[PDB]
Amino acid sequence: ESKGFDYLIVGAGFAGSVLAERLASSGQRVLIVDRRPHIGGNAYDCYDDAGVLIHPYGPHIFHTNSKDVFEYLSRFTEWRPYQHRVLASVDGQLLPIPINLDTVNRLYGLNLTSFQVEEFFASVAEKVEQVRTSEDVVVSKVGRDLYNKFFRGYTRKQWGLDPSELDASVTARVPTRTNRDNRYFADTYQAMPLHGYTRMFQNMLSSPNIKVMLNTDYREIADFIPFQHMIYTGPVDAFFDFCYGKLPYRSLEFRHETHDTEQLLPTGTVNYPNDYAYTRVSEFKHITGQRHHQTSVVYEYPRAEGDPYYPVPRPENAELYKKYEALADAAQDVTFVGRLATYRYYNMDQVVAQALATFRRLQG
Amino acid sequence: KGFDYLIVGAGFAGSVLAERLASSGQRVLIVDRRPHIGGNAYDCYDDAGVLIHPYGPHIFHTNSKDVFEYLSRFTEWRPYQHRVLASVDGQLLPIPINLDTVNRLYGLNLTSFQVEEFFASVAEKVEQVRTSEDVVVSKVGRDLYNKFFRGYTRKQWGLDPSELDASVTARVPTRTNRDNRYFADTYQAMPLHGYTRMFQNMLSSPNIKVMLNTDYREIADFIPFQHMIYTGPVDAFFDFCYGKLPYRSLEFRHETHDTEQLLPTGTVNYPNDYAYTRVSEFKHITGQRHHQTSVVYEYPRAEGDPYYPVPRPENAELYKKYEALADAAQDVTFVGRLATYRYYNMDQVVAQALATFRRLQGQ
Ligand SMILES: Cc1cc2nc3c(=O)[nH]c(=O)nc-3n(C[C@H](O)[C@H](O)[C@H](O)COP(=O)(O)OP(=O)(O)OC[C@H]3O[C@@H](n4cnc5c(N)ncnc54)[C@H](O)[C@@H]3O)c2cc1C
């Protein structure tokens, strides 16, 4: 039709890359761009100095209930079945989280059945008018003491806020159980890409219709490169030059280490609600299924400043986003999709859905 | 506006130049039709977790202190002296041919001093040496030429050593000593973490934008650039106006085995057997520790991606006709193995690029 590209996609993570593949399979000329020197966004993996497969930006475990998302992804990767399991260091023990029958019995030295632990949870639970805060969701189900041990400290360390300063959506992510299930997810499809996300993303972007541009801020090229439409997957407040001020995103620092032993942790991840500066340690071999004479772990330190990783879900922040959203829905030739761009605390599968949905919209 | 340079190809040629140009403040756009950087020297991890080179074994070696020190700013080193065995007469023998090759082959017991006289007694004298047959035959004799060189060369090029310039089979000198190293260079070492990691450091500058999966022709029309550095094949750049320049290609067959070690050295050559010219085992080269092993067999091909220029008098003439157009380009600089039609090693390409950088700065 004209010079340049039909689409200019800003960001090569799940949001941007899914659309890039859909548009290009549809015959669109697509330029995908990322300020980072690699594709895959947060989900990027690679081999470290020791030859172990890791995630530079923390542990990404894939899980979904969407047969459609799982089948779409199945087009670009084979799978390694895996059901993630997390232990929480509490009172010098490693207990299951989410809280379940075993957590209670092990913590207090009880012997409740699955039927009795309901009466117990009910016997300590705090009555809450209406549930609004992350404090509310937890305390109204399992009571004050279990809240202090598992949720209050972790949350304050992770967010820099009390759970009461956070939307109930936040801690509602980790629901309590009364059975003896110890998986962090009870999703239908739990599995990791056989050869890593990066290999999966490379297939996703392999069309002749797709051009990949790296180490590039869209603003550096958007001036002299012709494109008929733009898909932005970065932060919003930044897209509109913070005109309304800074939309708060919580950040992280990662400290990777390699140990001359086959196994360091009992599970993929151990949470630290009450001790240490880090929130958790992850061991990639548990996740990937890789065999190696050594192992590599990563420690996560929450940070107020740095690359945005988490939207900060709270009443005041929801308001501030709306104003930016208004500008966004107003943007004539720009479509906003992704965790950062639409300010949603989304998992990988959720972003893939929202991207696939957005694709269908771009075709009436 | 736009970029000061458009660099076509992210191999050694383009990457060294990207780095040098960017370092001096220039805005660079390096592009490649491949999905990765590094060109031929690109390495990666296979499904088994073994570090391999998708495009055949790349072993770094050099006599140039300046090239090694330049590269040393983007990678650490694993000292490595590549050793190659040739499968001849049912034995695994040292190549280049040396004292031990001859002694073991013919069941002799010569000293270094005697083997000079032996080679002399079998050598066919050639008045003026012009072909790959001459260089070999005029030194080691007809028989040894047949065992190690003729079969291999015919298989690799589809040409007889006599139809190739003396420079081809001259890359493999004959020895009278007992040195079994393939190279005798001063600096022989591998990038500690592979080439890709090194390239990544070479292209880390904020003044470098990287475009992959892109042929320059797809963006040349709407992207502003003041000068172009071209590292691809020459004939393709001028749309084959003088007909096609002969390049030689390869097919690679990669295998993984459930054993720690398959071969006795990094590479085994087959001058006289099989459809492949050689077999390589990457662990000997990388030094990686793994419970399994990955090898690659190389099959010479007439058609495919260009890997080797074909050094012969009629091909020199043809290239010159293209080299003439290249010089009249005025805003395109040609550099590399493919772009200047030279059978260059990695270190030679780096030198060529560093030199070209100097010329461009007037230095
Ligand atoms: C620590 C951590 C752990 C996680 N664990 C899980 C998990 O276990 N399971 C799960 O399902 N999900 C997990 N996730 C969530 C998952 O990462 C997200 O669902 C996913 O990253 C969403 O991708 P996205 O494309 O929307 O955003 P992103 O992955 O962040 O992609 C945005 C990209 O755009 C680029 N960009 C931004 N601005 C510009 C610009 N101006 N110019 C050019 N490029 C730009 C950025 O560099 C970035 O690469 C985790 C996330 C984090 C941070």
Ligand SMILES: Cc1cc2nc3c(=O)[nH]c(=O)nc-3n(C[C@H](O)[C@H](O)[C@H](O)COP(=O)(O)OP(=O)(O)OC[C@H]3O[C@@H](n4cnc5c(N)ncnc54)[C@H](O)[C@@H]3O)c2cc1C
């Ligand atoms: C099988 C094999 C084994 C080798 N072993 C050794 C060794 O052991 N030791 C050693 O020192 N050297 C070795 N070499 C030689 C070494 O690989 C080269 O010297 C080196 O690759 C030089 O890189 P280059 O940048 O000049 O060319 P290349 O690496 O080929 O880079 C050229 C790039 O330009 C791109 N390109 C071309 N045309 C276009 C276009 N139209 N649009 C966009 N992109 C384009 C190509 O995709 C390619 O990536 C070996 C070579 C081969 C083939």
Ligand SMILES: O=c1ccn([C@@H]2O[C@H](COP(=O)(O)OP(=O)(O)O)[C@@H](O)[C@H]2O)c(=O)[nH]1
């Ligand atoms: O052991 C835990 C695990 C979770 N959380 C809270 O639940 C939220 C969601 O945790 P999840 O692991 O699902 O989020 P992630 O960090 O993985 O993105 C966290 O931010 C915490 O506030 C907690 O308090 N204790």
Ligand SMILES: O=c1ccn([C@@H]2O[C@H](COP(=O)(O)OP(=O)(O)O)[C@@H](O)[C@H]2O)c(=O)[nH]1
């Ligand atoms: O065992 C050998 C090794 C090399 N050669 C000849 O020497 C040339 C250069 O060998 P080299 O190993 O340097 O080629 P490359 O590794 O670049 O493919 C080849 O083309 C062959 O013609 C040969 O005949 N037998």
